[PDB]
Write a protein that binds this DNA or RNA. Sequence first.
DNA 1: CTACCGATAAGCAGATCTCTCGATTGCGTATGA
DNA 2: TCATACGCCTCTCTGCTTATCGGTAG
RNA 3: UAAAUCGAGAG
Lengths: 98, 59, 98, 141, 610, 57, 47, 162, 115
Amino acid sequence: DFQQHEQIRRKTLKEKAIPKDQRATTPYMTKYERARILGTRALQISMNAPVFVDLEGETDPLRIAMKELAEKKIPLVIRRYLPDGSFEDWSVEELIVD
Amino acid sequence: TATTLNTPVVIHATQLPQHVSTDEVLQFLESFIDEKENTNLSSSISQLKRIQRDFKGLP
Amino acid sequence: DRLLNSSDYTQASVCRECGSILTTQQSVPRIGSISTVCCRRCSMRFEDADSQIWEDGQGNKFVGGNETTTVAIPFVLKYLDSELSAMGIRLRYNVEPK
Amino acid sequence: GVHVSYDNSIRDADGTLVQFMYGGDAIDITKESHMTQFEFCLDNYYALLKKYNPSALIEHLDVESALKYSKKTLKYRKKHSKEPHYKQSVKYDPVLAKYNPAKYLGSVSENFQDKLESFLDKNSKGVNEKKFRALMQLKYM
Amino acid sequence: MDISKPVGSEITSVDFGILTAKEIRNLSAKQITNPTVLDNLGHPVSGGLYDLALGAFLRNLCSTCGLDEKFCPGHQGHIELPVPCYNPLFFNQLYIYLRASCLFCHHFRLKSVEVHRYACKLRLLQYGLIDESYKLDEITLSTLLNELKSKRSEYVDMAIAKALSDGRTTERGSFTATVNDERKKLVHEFHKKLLSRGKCDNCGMFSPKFRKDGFTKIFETALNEKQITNNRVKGSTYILSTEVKNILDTVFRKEQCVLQYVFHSRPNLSRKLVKADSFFMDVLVVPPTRFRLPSKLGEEVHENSQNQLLSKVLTTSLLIRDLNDDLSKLQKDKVSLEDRRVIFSRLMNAFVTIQNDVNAFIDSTKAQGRTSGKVPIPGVKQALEKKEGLFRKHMMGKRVNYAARSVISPDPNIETNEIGVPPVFAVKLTYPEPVTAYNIAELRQAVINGPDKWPGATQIQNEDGSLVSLIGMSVEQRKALANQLLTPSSNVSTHTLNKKVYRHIKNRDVVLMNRQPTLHKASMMGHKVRVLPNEKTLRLHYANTGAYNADFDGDEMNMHFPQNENARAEALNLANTDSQYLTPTSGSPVRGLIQDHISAGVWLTSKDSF
Amino acid sequence: KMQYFLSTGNLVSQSGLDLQQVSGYTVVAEKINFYRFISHFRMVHRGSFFAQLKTTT
Amino acid sequence: TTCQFLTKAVLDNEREQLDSPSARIVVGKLNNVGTGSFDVLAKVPNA
Amino acid sequence: NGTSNCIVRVPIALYVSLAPMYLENPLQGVMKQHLNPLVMKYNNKVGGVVLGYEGLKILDADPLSKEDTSEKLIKITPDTPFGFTWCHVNLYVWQPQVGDVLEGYIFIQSASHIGLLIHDAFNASGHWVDSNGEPIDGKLRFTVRNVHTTGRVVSVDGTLIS
Amino acid sequence: MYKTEKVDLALNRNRGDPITQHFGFGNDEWPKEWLEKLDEDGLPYIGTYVEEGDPICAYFDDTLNKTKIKTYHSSEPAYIEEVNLIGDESNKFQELQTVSIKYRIRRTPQIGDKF
DNA sequence: CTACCGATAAGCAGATCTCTCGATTGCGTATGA
DNA sequence: TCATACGCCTCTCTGCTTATCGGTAG
RNA sequence: UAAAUCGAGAG
Ligand SMILES: [Mg+2]
Ligand SMILES: [Zn+2]
Ligand SMILES: [Zn+2]
Ligand SMILES: [Zn+2]
């Protein structure tokens, strides 16, 4: 009753997924991606998400997220969207800042 | 109440009812409490404490 | 933030089958029930046809069509859709988790 | 709606392409300021290199294929510079066509490459031309 | 907006469509009959335009959802008109379609093989097979006109199956700019060819065309000189809405397939037959009372203009319904020629005036008749057309909360990336900082300070949106609330959230500034915040004047305060002033000192300066 | 009628008076400053019809 | 020409896929240019 | 019961919202956020009242990922740090059916309404004279022709006659 | 800055209609804090400090059988300068229904002002 | 000879950034008093 | 004699669209 | 607290 609805979407989703071996986008983390990741990480910390980076009395979630990115421990995964709908899945750890 | 913080967005049921064996009715109530406290309560629940012994013995 | 989040952010209710925003309304509970939101289009009249039946403010009885979801939209979109309905034009909004 | 995609090709939000390369080069205009100031770049080489950190930009980069293809194309057009334009039967298209300029070091425009070669030919400077060329290609990337 | 209230479902796409009179009569809460708004007492008359079931009006709880005025969404209604009327939206389409039709055979006045040619062309091109659409015309080679068609159907279906099979086009079809261009070109040319000739080459029995007067009248003359002679061998009147609808429906029933392939661009599940009840509104729609609420002076009350137009429509409809009852009673026995003629003439001009009434209700310009007047009332189309329309005024740009506007005064004592926020601003604008294990001390201090002492808090929003305002509480109450800021929540549904303090705009925040007109990007940056507790005007460094093209000519510029961490980080990194050093126009710099610092540098860097 | 004419500026007449414009014939003599007041009794307006045409000769 | 384009849009049952920024603004969805040109996924170490 | 068991297991696919607080324990977060409140509740989609859950699975958004890896991806909505994902759980639901016979006990009796408690868990609504004269006891067979679902807990109403 | 206003209670008084509201105080339980910045009659004093939310004139409305007060309509505090009891030209000797209040605001030179 | 196709000329339709103050709001008429 | 509710009471640019009059096939 | 038109206008 529901399987035919679900299976067709997962096949389409797996179709657009570009394999890790053949992602030909920019290895660097773009400025937009840096801003978005910093904002989302700061929102998570503000919503009491666990943090593994020590805080030296800092109170600004945005500064906490910037410190995390500088030390490269952000537990976030990007999803670059190609125009057709294909998506590649880079990680912040393998991304290069600037 | 009853916002997205406590209720799923969609509750679509896949496959079908797959338990008409009438013989494998055990192994859940004897195991659900094992995975519960080893504390779900809104204001008061009591039917969970009197719904297992019906199939096994007497209240 | 400058157009939707802090201007007219509304968490309206939308039916997936109907595809319309304002066709839904809150059912009036009879005794010890929960006032959910249901369609005025998906539901058919009890004459043309409990958990299956919800009533309205006029005392009429409506059965079925209790599927819907909450989406974040500007209220100005609702006003535009009303004005379009005044023209006889209907807009159907395709909801993602159908 | 038209914006540059993840393939460095600008196209409308629909998907309809406008150009394959942003101006044929895909270098940001706000950063195009000092990619022609060869003398300034050479003078500030050490600070520029410390800013760029080429050491950390190797494990996620490929240099040899793009460099070889660009050299082959450059010598091809050098052999094929003086002739009518309609006769220029292209055998090797410009390096931007295949190699992603943000993924393959050395993939630069034909104008920038020509200007860099002309500068390195005319001006003879302790830093060598090879390290300067590597830094300039990293700057373009 | 609220951060602690996420939503999963989102509108992926929106598709337009027409309203069938069945569904709107199925969904409506009440009809509308009496053309009176309010009685002597001011109570909403049952069945009136402000009907109690069409949305709550003043204190009256709405009698459809049973909620208050601010809780009732506002349900829609409908007027059961007894006569169909031409839609001014689709009047041109109807006039063009029925102009190129034959009365007798009820087919298009063009040939019946071009009909299938265009049907197959549109069906095949709908799937984005452009080359196949043009290659179909190569299948060219009376009774032979059916053997040709069977070849085209096979070629069309084979190509679509082939294109679908190899991934060239998903079953949903490929709608891009070029296929849209070809659709428009082919459809416009096909309609123009329909309007081209006059003799029907399907049955021979040609039919007279129809004329127009304004946008509500149709005229024809079935009697001519030669067109009379030929149709015998082939064997300024008025055109009525019901019979023009009849011939429309006949033509559409005849040519369903072509009407489908010409009234659709997305080739999927287009099963719903395109009928004739798409240009006639037998049932009109009234917006909810919440959207039709009237104006309100300090004492004067003014009638809603849309409600007045609907009341006029009701007046004409009730007059027509009354006159038809007079028609029926006089139909019992044959009456004097004068009486039936005058009542039928009254019905005729009543239909004309109801057509004009609907035309004026939609568009103001189409209304006919004005000698002196006072003002031409704008219609629904006039509410969404011009710059003052709803689109350009309330969807491409809206008034914003948490934003200020004042004069800017210069200050060479802020580091060219901050702004000087006067304390009068700093006591109004707030940010909803959520409480937590590291923000507890600072937020507790802000709460204790309160809404008057900067830095301070104005509202303490609990997890369940219970905004506890601090405006009217004393010091001991504020202290107790601060000491109760971080406590476990009893409700499990809210156990994943924590209270938010609407603390004043501190020194670490960031705002956006804009000097209208925002001609280019630099006219809207993001400056950091510096709270100078002296003045009452915004303080701005001198480097930004050149970028803003601003002055200090008493210029007033806005100051938006983003409220979510996404916007904060996005303005701090992408839109910040330092990153906007070089304009993207030509790469030249746009910042730097201007007037006296330049002469100061010239004097200081000279040789005499020891 | 004269009070309305002076109060609203709009001219109502059945002869046209050989004048191009219809409105804007009276101005409120602002008492903001004596300079403004004395300047009120000296300007000449070419006509409200000349405030829209795009030519600048 | 809102009237002109709406008539054509509804007459042929033209469906908007919410691609252009203006359509996203009208509906009220996150834009597709720049920061909204991708998506962000959270990596969770479950069992 | 009368040659009927019900209590049928039903795997479900649900769209849960995961709070950022439970970002290092997503499965426990999901169960405590959605699945635990679903217990002892009559859900129309599942069919009846739910007695628990089992078999948590995360339908992560990574298609290249193995179906058994310990790390999963959670989609985060743009305007919120909350994460949304699909899930697979096994739901055990006791399903009454109209037109059947059920065995239940008697707890509360009144002059007008007679209370029946199917397995002392289905709330519904002083010995007197019966057909055989036996005093009313807790054991009897009834009909389920009438079902009321407007209260806090569903109820079963019927009569001895067919 | 000299700013004046005219509060009129005869706006809704139709031609020949008996006077609906008078100036002054009724017999209701109005707060005593109203007596500040309002005289024995309906008019206020002269040279008093009035801000937003401060009453100007108190009028007795017999339709509701209560005394209502008007309110200041400007953020900047002002000083009452003149209270002109303007009378009616008709033969009927109606009570006070038209009065003019003049306000004075200290427009000291603050920053941002144009010289 | 006469139907089909373009080539002007007239009409039709639509165009030529924010905000604050102040001012203002119809004649004609027709019957119940 | 005479008051408020009804009834109306003349100095700019781009297209697109259709009507009418020339030429050519049969 | 409305809504429209006119004048003064500010950048
Ligand atoms: Mg300026
Ligand atoms: Zn629905
Ligand atoms: Zn309502
Ligand atoms: Zn015919």
